[PDB]
Structure formats: structure tokens, C-alpha cells
Ligand binder design. Structure first.
Ligand SMILES: [Mg+2]
Ligand SMILES: [Mg+2]
Length: 582
């Protein structure tokens, strides 16, 4: 029988309740989280139902997501505390959304998330709801979810929301699996068919996590994909013996680690292209930490939970699962974050350096390859963010305004690259003869030495400088806990060409000959150009140029304009939290 015999069988089982109640009693953070979620439930009890109302885009997705949060939080509070105001509020919400004319299947994410919300509450309140509500909910799940997805599996093309390569596949198949399992005792044959088709089609999306767990589309996209993926993984682990092998797909084991490990210690996101912080507190992290035995991720997510509660941050629609999924594990003292690791991806390789995290002033550095012709990308191959003492000493200026004239004209001669934020002049990489990178090139990791005493990695950037250089290689080397060396090897096509080493910063800048001192809130960082001999740093403010740009304020640029003997040589810059890098 391919489901647990009794409700609740979805995400937080009956058998799991005893241990969760003990955590709430015995673990302060879990206890604080329980009280926090109970208080959220308290206001949800007295919050109006949402009218069926499409947004400017023609869908109700925001409303479905609202009900995921409302129904999950209310039903959790009823299971943990037994106060019938939580049950009755969930009953009212269930009847309300079942009396919607539809769950807007023309934009099927709407149906996927509404079915998820409804299935969870139905399952979690099964013995505690009026029979008339259970009858109506079962019929709505059957007609609006199970019947539709069975048709979609049989008739849908590869472009179908159940089969395409985008995260719609994961979200929709997940919502359908949860709906099917929620009413499985009444539709067991349908639930088995849906389980098998979900496992068949979901790899069309999830194969793109291979090999190392990188989500090219960025953290918001990752957060939506994996919040629903973890519901699926947990549900089929609990109900179907893990059949279908989704959990073992290459890259999935490492994907939460990627998200945690690519933040600076102070929490700053590598905001390249149009990436931005919005996905923070999805409970997916606790499923990954438990299923793949990564206490490092659990410990990091608990810190995020504390901050979410302390600063009253916005909640992921599935945030309520953080409590039943609570993972109290921590890494052992002996376990260390590697000094250097690389996350390979077909579009942009990601490089991550860590000096000894237990030594104050040690360096964190993250850098990227990339393909600038891809959507939303910048001419930023080789750029890096370095952090020490809680300060990001180099920057990424983020995306500019999507409304700008020619913002999408991404051809090599296109208007997109005239904007500072889009081109390499704002990024921490090379400009030859004060020109932009070639938009149709790429930078990628071509050599790695992650186990050396001074670990290093080499990027091939040649094709980003196609008309200017016959080869361009950038090597990052961690010389010690406090010091990174960047070696650019450039074979110029013209021996008089100038190689500009550029970096952006929000720190105060003092330059003198081949040295830079950066200052921020009394903390310092240092840079020294050691090759070619006699090179000089200058500095100047970044500024706006074209009307309609997001304001560019508080950014300073560093630039070393370097000639190379015979047009062939090296630019070598050492960077350290200590002034002496001899
Ligand atoms: Mg950028
Ligand atoms: Mg590669």
C-alpha cells in the first residue's frame, strides 16, 4: 500500500508528534519558534478570507500562496495546542477556497499551491473537521487536482506544466502528489499513477541541478523550486518508501550547501546579474540537513530562524514547516569548511575560498565564471567579492532598471552594455584598452588545486577578450588565512595595449603607488600590485551616466592601468586583512 494508513500522512506524520512536542519543551529555539507560530495563528484566526480576485497578470497565485501559509499555520497550531479557534478558522478557510469557482488552472501554479494548502489542512485536521467539510474538500481535490493531472500526464506535451524543464514541473507535480496522497485512501489507484508519473517527469527540471547543485536562475528561483521539492521528497520518503530515486539525482545532495556556503560570513549574497535577496527562510533547509546529514545547514538555518523572529522578517509561505522539521544538529568541532571548493555549472562556475573561519580577519572570497549572453547576465567574468572582519571589501553594483532603453539588446555591440552596472567597468575584473568584454565569450574553471597548502583555481577568460588578447587566464590563490593572490596572465594582441585591473568598493579608499588601503567603520583592508613592476593604483567615484538609471551612490572604483613587456605578461594583485603581504 503506497501510503501511510492513517492521517496525518503529509509532511508531519502522527508518529512524529511526540518528538516534536518534546523539542518544544526542551529546546529554547524550538520553543520560541512554536510560540512565534502560535502567535501568527492567533492573528490568522481573525483575518478575513481573501476574495477570488486575479492580479494585473491574470492569476490568483498570491492568493493561493496566502492560503498555504494560513492553512498550514492554523492546522499546525491546532495539532500542537488543541484550541478549537485554530480548527474552526481552518474549517472556514477550507470551505471558502473550495467555494471559489475554480483554482485558476489556466495558470496552474495557482492550482498547485492551492491544492497543497488544502491537502495539508485536510490531512492534518482529518478527524477534527465536520464531515460536510471533508466531503467538499475531498471532491475539490479530486476534481480540481487529481482529474486534471491525470489528463495532463496522458495528453500533455513536453511543454506541459507537468513535463517542462522549468520549476513549474517541480511545483506542479509536488502539489499534485500531495493532493493525491491526501485523499489516497479514497483514490488509491490514482495516487499510485500520480506518484509514478511525478517521479518520471520531475527529472526534466531537476537534471539542471547537476552536477554540483547550482541553480543558475538564482536564489529566488532556487527557493521556489526547492521549497516544493522538499515537500515531495519528504512525502514520498514517508509514504512510498522513497520510490523513484528523485532524492539521489546528482547535485540535489549539495544544493542546500551551495546556498549556505556561497553567502559571506556576514550574510551577504553574491548579487551578480539580477540576483537578489528574497529567498531566506524556506524550511527546505531542514529537510536537506536531515535527509543528507548536513548539520552545518541545520545550524545555519537555526540562525536564520532567530533573525526571522527577532527582526520580524517576511515569511516563506511554507515557513510553518520549520517547526515539525526542526533539526537540532550541529557540526562536530573537527569538521571544517574546505579552504577552496568549486561549484561547477554549465553557465557559471562558482569559486569559494575560506581562510580559517575561527581566526579573526580571515578571508572569504567568492568568484564566478559566466556566459554574458544569457538572460540578465553582466560582463563580469572573473569578478569576486572578498570579505574579512564582517566587511565586503569589493562589491557588485547589482542590476539596473529593467525599463532602460535597449536594456535587453545584449549583442556584443548592443545598448545593454553601455550601462555601467551591466558592463565590466563596474566589476572586479579586467578591461583592456578601456573596452568592454566580448558578450558572446565565456569564463570557466579550467584548472583546480583544492588540496594544495596554498589552494588555487584558474579561470579561462580568453573568449571574453577575443579581439584584444590571444589568452587571458585568472588564477586565485589562498596564500594564507589572511591573504589572496590574483594572477592574471594576458597575451595581448597589441604590445602597447593597457590592462586595467578594476575593483568596486563601498569602503573609503586611499591609494599610493602600488598600494591600496580600504577603510570602513575603522576596519581596514589592503591591496598591493606586485606585477608588473612599477604599477600604480588610482581611484575615482563611480557615477551615473544615462537618465533612468538606479542611483549610483557611495561606490568607489580602484583601477591599476598596467602595461606588459612586449604585450605579454602578468598582473598580480595581493589582497589581505594585514598590511604586510611580503
Ligand atoms: Mg553585476
Ligand atoms: Mg566546466
Amino acid at each position: 500500500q503506497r501510503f501511510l494508513s492513517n492521517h496525518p500522512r503529509l509532511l508531519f506524520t502522527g508518529a512524529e508528534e511526540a518528538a516534536v512536542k518534546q523539542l518544544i519543551q526542551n529546546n529554547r529555539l524550538a520553543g520560541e519558534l512554536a510560540e512565534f507560530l502560535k502567535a501568527k495563528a492567533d492573528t490568522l484566526v481573525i483575518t478575513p478570507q481573501k476574495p477570488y480576485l486575479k492580479d494585473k497578470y491574470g492569476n490568483i497565485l498570491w492568493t493561493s500562496r496566502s492560503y498555504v501559509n494560513r492553512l498550514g499555520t492554523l492546522a499546525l497550531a491546532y495539532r500542537l495546542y488543541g484550541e478549537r479557534k485554530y480548527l474552526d478558522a481552518a474549517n472556514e478557510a477550507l470551505l471558502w477556497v473550495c467555494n471559489y469557482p475554480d483554482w485558476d488552472p489556466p495558470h496552474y501554479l495557482d492550482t498547485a499551491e492551492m491544492a497543497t494548502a488544502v491537502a495539508i489542512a485536510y490531512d492534518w485536521l482529518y478527524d477534527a473537521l465536520p464531515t460536510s467539510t471533508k466531503d467538499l474538500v475531498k471532491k475539490c481535490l479530486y476534481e480540481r487536482a487529481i482529474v486534471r493531472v491525470l489528463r495532463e500526464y496522458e495528453k500533455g506535451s513536453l511543454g506541459s506544466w507537468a513535463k517542462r524543464e522549468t520549476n513549474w514541473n517541480v511545483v506542479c507535480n509536488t502539489g499534485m502528489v500531495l493532493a493525491a496522497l491526501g485523499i489516497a485512501e479514497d483514490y488509491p489507484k490514482e495516487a499510485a499513477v500520480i506518484l509514478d508519473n511525478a517521479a518520471k517527469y520531475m527529472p526534466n527540471c531537476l537534471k539542471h541541478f547537476a552536477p554540483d547543485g547550482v541553480c543558475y536562475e538564482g536564489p529566488a528561483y532556487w527557493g521556489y523550486t526547492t521549497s516544493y521539492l522538499t515537500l515531495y521528497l519528504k512525502a514520498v520518503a514517508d509514504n512510498d518508501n522513497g520510490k523513484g530515486g528523485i532524492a539521489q539525482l546528482p547535485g540535489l545532495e549539495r544544493t542546500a550547501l551551495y546556498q549556505k556556503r556561497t553567502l559571506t560570513p556576514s550574510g551577504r549574497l553574491f548579487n551578480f546579474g539580477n540576483a537578489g535577496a528574497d529567498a531566506q527562510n524556506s524550511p527546505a533547509f531542514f529537510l536537506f540537513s536531515r535527509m543528507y546529514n548536513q548539520p552545518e545547514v541545520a545550524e545555519w538555518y537555526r540562525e536564520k530562524l532567530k533573525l526571522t523572529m527577532q527582526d520580524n522578517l517576511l515569511l516563506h509561505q511554507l515557513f510553518f514547516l520549520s517547526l515539525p522539521w526542526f533539526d537540532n544538529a550541529s557540526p562536530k568541532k573537527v569538521e571544517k569548511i574546505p579552504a577552496l571548493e568549486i561549484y561547477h555549472n554549465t553557465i557559471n562556475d562558482i569559486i569559494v575560498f575560506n581562510g580559517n573561519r575561527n581566526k579573526k580577519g580571515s578571508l572569504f572570497l567568492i568568484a564566478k565564471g559566466g556566459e554574458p549572453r544569457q538572460a540578465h547576465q553582466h560582463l563580469d567574468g572573473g569578478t569576486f567579492i572578498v570579505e574579512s572582519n564582517g566587511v565586503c571589501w569589493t562589491e557588485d553594483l547589482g542590476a539596473d532598471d529593467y525599463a532602460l532603453p535597449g536594456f535587453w539588446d545584449g549583442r556584443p555591440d548592443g545598448q545593454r552594455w553601455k550601462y555601467f552596472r551591466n558592463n565590466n567597468f563596474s566589476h572586479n575584473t579586467l578591461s583592456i584598452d578601456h573596452k568592454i568584454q566580448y558578450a558572446n565569450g565565456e569564463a570557466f574553471v579550467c584548472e583546480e588545486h583544492t588540496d594544495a597548502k596554498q589552494p588555487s583555481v584558474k579561470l579561462d577568460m580568453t573568449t571574453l577578450y577575443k579581439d584584444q588578447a590571444s589568452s587571458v587566464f585568472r588564477t586565485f590563490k589562498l596564500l594564507n588565512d589572511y591573504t589572496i593572490e590574483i594572477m592574471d596572465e594576458v597575451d595581448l594582441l597589441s604590445p602597447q595595449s593597457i590592462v586595467s585591473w578594476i575593483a568596486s568598493t563601498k569602503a573609503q579608499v586611499e591609494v599610493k603607488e602600488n598600494r591600496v588601503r580600504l577603510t570602513h567603520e575603522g576596519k581596514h583592508f589592503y591591496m598591493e600590485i606586485i606585477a608588473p613592476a612599477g604599477a600604480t593604483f588610482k581611484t575615482y567615484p563611480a557615477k551615473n551616466t544615462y537618465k533612468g538609471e538606479y542611483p549610483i551612490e557611495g561606490y568607489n572604483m580602484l583601477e591599476a592601468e598596467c602595461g606588459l613587456e612586449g604585450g605579454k605578461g602578468k598582473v598580480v594583485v595581493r589582497m589581505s586583512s594585514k598590511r604586510n603581504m611580503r
